[PDB]
């Protein structure tokens, strides 16, 4: 769910998830995808095509199981698609994380910004 | 959409929207709904089950006509969905306005992964 991604993304980056990765670039938020502005925007972009994979399950309300032990983010579910849900939602928390030194403020929006097109997952 | 939205919590509250009501609490803004904080985050909470039961247009990129007429938000649309949207949004802007005296700034940009479950809709 998203209360599962919003944590992991806060471990992973240790910002607020909301603020910095609700409304940035054309894939970061809840606008769907666009052409990415920069690595972070990118990191959404896959997070959203990694919830298109998905089968059967609610990226947004299926809650899951997972370790935050050593301060690292492990998927213990039980569920191939909650299972499969997870990876998704890690793999964006950590890929926020690695593409910090490249964070742009600027690409944060309050409405829907100027994106060019994303090609099919 | 978005933009109708954030308008009419312009108007209501005076308040930027964006700013105030962005990333508020458990349930303004992006991040779907936790139990709500104050009254202002219970506004966002009953906004967002208002949008649930919105048949056939999407609350975040559909546009709809108002009017603002002696200061007060009159939905004009003629489609039920975007007329049924445009009252949700009224709703929200007002209830907003409403619990100003209790906004709490410390929740401004709150931390989701903070919030409790939300009571379903």
């Known amino acids: 769910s998203l209360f599962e991604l919003g944590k992991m993304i806060l471990?992973?980056?240790?910002?607020?998830?909301?603020?910095?990765?609700?409304?940035?670039?054309?894939?970061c938020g809840v606008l769907?995808?666009?052409?990415?502005?920069d690595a972070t925007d990118r990191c959404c972009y896959v997070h959203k095509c990694c919830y298109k994979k998905l089968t059967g399950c609610d990226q947004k309300?299926?809650?899951?199981?997972?370790?935050?032990?050593?301060?690292?983010?492990?998927?213990?579910?039980?569920?191939?698609?909650?299972?499969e849900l997870c990876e998704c939602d890690k793999?964006?928390?950590?890929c926020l994380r690695e593409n910090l030194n490249t964070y742009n403020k600027k690409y944060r929006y309050h409405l829907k910004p100027l994106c060019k097109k994303a090609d099919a997952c």
């Open 11 to 27: 471990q992973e980056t240790g910002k607020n998830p909301a603020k910095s990765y609700g409304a940035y670039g054309c894939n």
């Open 32 to 37: 769907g995808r666009g052409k990415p502005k």
């Open 61 to 83: 309300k299926d809650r899951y199981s997972y370790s935050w032990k050593d301060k690292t983010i492990v998927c213990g579910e039980n569920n191939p698609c909650l299972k």
């Open 91 to 94: 793999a964006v928390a950590i």
